[PDB]
Structure 1
Amino acid sequence: GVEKVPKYDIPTKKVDYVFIELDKMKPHEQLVQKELEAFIESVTGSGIFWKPMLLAKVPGEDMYLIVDGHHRWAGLQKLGAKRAPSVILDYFSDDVKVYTWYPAFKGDLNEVVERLKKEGLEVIEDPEAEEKAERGEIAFALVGEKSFAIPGGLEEQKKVSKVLDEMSVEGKIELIYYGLKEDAREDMAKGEIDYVFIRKAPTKEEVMELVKRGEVYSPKTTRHVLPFNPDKIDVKLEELF
């Protein structure tokens, strides 16, 4: 899937990194196999690791939440590496926000209404669907020409994501992940998109809770807006083993 986000000015800041052991880092999303493979291919190609992990200390545990860096972490593990350069964030600062992504596609709601129904889901026509989704009462609202409620919670969200990640890689839909619901609705009006999937965004406390339960969200659940991007770093891959 293709990210499609606004032009946020987020400043680069020169924040030093520290090496943290990979087995002390906890993911909060399922991995995308394509992203993992691409990182492995890139890092082995140059032998430079230039983009630190962004981490948050798990309260009460000798562990860190991966805020940004799931595929770097997993890819380094698969290569046999032991650590990664990391920037530790003040995650519960008001300066850090968490939003979600809005999976939107161009296509027909037929190979998708039925192919979600094959994974085991319901799709009830409901004018209040988006309203219910945003209060966190259903798994997804599905909005385009009509409005549909997809009942459930996390297990159901993972099924909706699953279908789409497969069909994207398969190439029967064009899957864009919108940073903003309203941008999807613009591109929808223009005809470039047909439907959008709307769930309530997780809170920071929920992300931390999920991690402490040893659980993960589906891909593209969190969209963290951070007060800075760390400047690039000069770490050799050989330093990570």
Structure 2
Amino acid sequence: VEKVPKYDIPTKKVDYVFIELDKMKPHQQLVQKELEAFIESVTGSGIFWKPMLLAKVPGEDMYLIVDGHHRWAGLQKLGAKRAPSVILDYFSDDVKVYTWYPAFKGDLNEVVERLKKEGLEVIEDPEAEEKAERGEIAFALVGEKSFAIPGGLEEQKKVSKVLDEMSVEGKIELIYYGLKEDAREDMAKGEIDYVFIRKAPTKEEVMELVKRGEVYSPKTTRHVLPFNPDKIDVKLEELF
């Protein structure tokens, strides 16, 4: 579940170009339910109406997937070869990269234990949020108390993996907030107990990870773009 600000992003009529799926590089792990929903939808209508948003990888014959991970993965699993795509000026100041703020209503002790079980530390620390925003720890975990979760990407992946696991199990309610202060607003309402805060990746870091053949956890990047492409008229049969 997502709570984003009411982003007035304009729709613009940008044309698409077919790009081969094997030239597209993901920067996040897939979410299997999102993959499956895309597959049901596209095969249901046989129309692919939402172009991929791509960025050329400097120095390679390859494109970063900016938006479209499950479209990409779902088309590949169906046997398709290409997708209609819009190529972005990614390094333009008009494109911004934020993150998501996983927030939870639930009990901190089950969550702290099942983080500790996957190898993480969870250390009470009043500077945790400050450290996380400078990118010095994996996450700050902030509610009634404040906890530092040390590490880097490996530990961020475990946190995401645990928060999704105990969703799958059913012990927690979980909103990904676009803004941490909207999670802190709702925190004060009683609807949210804890929020996980990490530093957002930069563009250069996103490219760097992709060039290393690595990926972030789901819900790591939150791109704010200068436009949403207008919808397109492409038949699924055209993609094979």
1:178 equivalent in structure 2: 177
Matched, 1:218 2:217: yes
**Cα distance, 1:19 vs structure 2:** 0.2
Listed one character per residue, the Cα deviations across residues 72-111 of structure 1 (whole Å, up to 9, x for unaligned) are 0000000000000000000000000000000000001011
Secondary structure of the structure 2 residue equivalent to 1:111: helix
RMSD over equivalenced CA pairs, Å? 0.5
Whole-Å separation in 2 of the counterparts to 1:106 and 1:22: 39
**Cα distance, 1:155 vs structure 2:** 0.2
**Cα distance, 1:171 vs structure 2:** 2.2
Q: Which moved more, 1:161-170 or 1:24-33?
A: 161-170
Whole-Å separation in 1 of the counterparts to 2:166 and 2:3: 18
Listed one character per residue, the Cα deviations across residues 29-73 of structure 1 (whole Å, up to 9, x for unaligned) are 000111001100111111100000000000000000000000000
Listed one character per residue, the Cα deviations across residues 144-171 of structure 1 (whole Å, up to 9, x for unaligned) are 0000000000000000000111222332
Matched, 1:27 2:48: no
Whole-Å separation in 1 of the counterparts to 2:197 and 2:55: 27
Whole-Å separation in 1 of the counterparts to 2:106 and 2:32: 24
Secondary structure of the structure 2 residue equivalent to 1:177: strand
Matched, 1:132 2:131: yes
Whole-Å separation in 2 of the counterparts to 1:108 and 1:204: 35
Whole-Å separation in 2 of the counterparts to 1:172 and 1:209: 36
Whole-Å separation in 2 of the counterparts to 1:156 and 1:33: 21
**Cα distance, 1:219 vs structure 2:** 0.6
Secondary structure of the structure 1 residue equivalent to 2:19: strand
Gaps of 5+ in 1: none
Secondary structure of the structure 1 residue equivalent to 2:161: helix
Which stretches of structure 1, 4 residues or more, deviate above 2 A after TM superposition?
A: none
Secondary structure of the structure 2 residue equivalent to 1:43: helix
Listed one character per residue, the Cα deviations across residues 12-36 of structure 1 (whole Å, up to 9, x for unaligned) are 0000000000000000000011100
Identity %: 100
Whole-Å separation in 2 of the counterparts to 1:124 and 1:163: 17
**Cα distance, 1:3 vs structure 2:** 1.1
Q: TM-score under structure 2 normalisation?
A: 0.99
Listed one character per residue, the Cα deviations across residues 107-157 of structure 1 (whole Å, up to 9, x for unaligned) are 010110000001110000000000000000000000000000000000000
Whole-Å separation in 2 of the counterparts to 1:167 and 1:21: 37
Q: Kindly tell me the number of residue pairs found equivalent between the two proteins.
A: 240
Secondary structure of the structure 2 residue equivalent to 1:206: helix
Whole-Å separation in 1 of the counterparts to 2:31 and 2:219: 10
Whole-Å separation in 2 of the counterparts to 1:56 and 1:48: 24
**Cα distance, 1:172 vs structure 2:** 1.6
Gaps of 5+ in 2: none
**Cα distance, 1:8 vs structure 2:** 0.8
Whole-Å separation in 1 of the counterparts to 2:171 and 2:36: 22
Q: TM-score under structure 1 normalisation?
A: 0.99
Listed one character per residue, the Cα deviations across residues 164-198 of structure 1 (whole Å, up to 9, x for unaligned) are 11222332211100000000000000000000000
